[PDB]
Design a protein around this ligand. Sequence first.
Ligand SMILES: Clc1ccc(-c2cnco2)cn1
Length: 209
Amino acid sequence: EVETFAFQAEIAQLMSLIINTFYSNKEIFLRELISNSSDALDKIRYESLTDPSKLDSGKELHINLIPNKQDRTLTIVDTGIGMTKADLINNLGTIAKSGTKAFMEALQAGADISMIGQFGVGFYSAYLVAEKVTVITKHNDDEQYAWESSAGGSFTVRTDTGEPMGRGTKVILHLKEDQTEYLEERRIKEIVKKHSQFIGYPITLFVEK
Ligand SMILES: Clc1ccc(-c2cnco2)cn1
């Protein structure tokens, strides 16, 4: 059973700007998604300080980067707090309407796309490199769900029958044909070292057969 939703107009406009603006510094998508994972891990860690049972769904707090050249996907997995169905529908747990308003003002006031994370909407930088994004998520208080969008003004949500996750979020980037450098080990390592060197969780770059 698949539910299809329209993006709020302001979010559709944000996505269109990300997809259509000429902007060469696309590699920041990875910094933004790793930062979101770190924020999600901080949240479950904080809850666990007063309620250790919050980690019954998984004690390890980490980030995995999983390239797959056969599927043309880069997957960012974290064991953070995850998202409820309501969070997914409400712009993946962001205040994206107000964040977009500020971001678009800043761009007209001199800012560039790399600054997107200062406005709480860094997730959408995935569309710098991905033609489709799938988000699989499991929060302690809800079931496992899959969100997906190829932009174009709509997203879907369905219960996920795939591999159970325990707790956290998996962002699957279905890369554009001309963006496959982001599956190359040396390129990913370079981006992590440049932009994510102070993230306080282990970031494991998986290798391929
Ligand atoms: Cl990641 C990103 C890329 C482009 C823009 C933008 C806004 N206005 C023109 O381009 C914002 N964020």
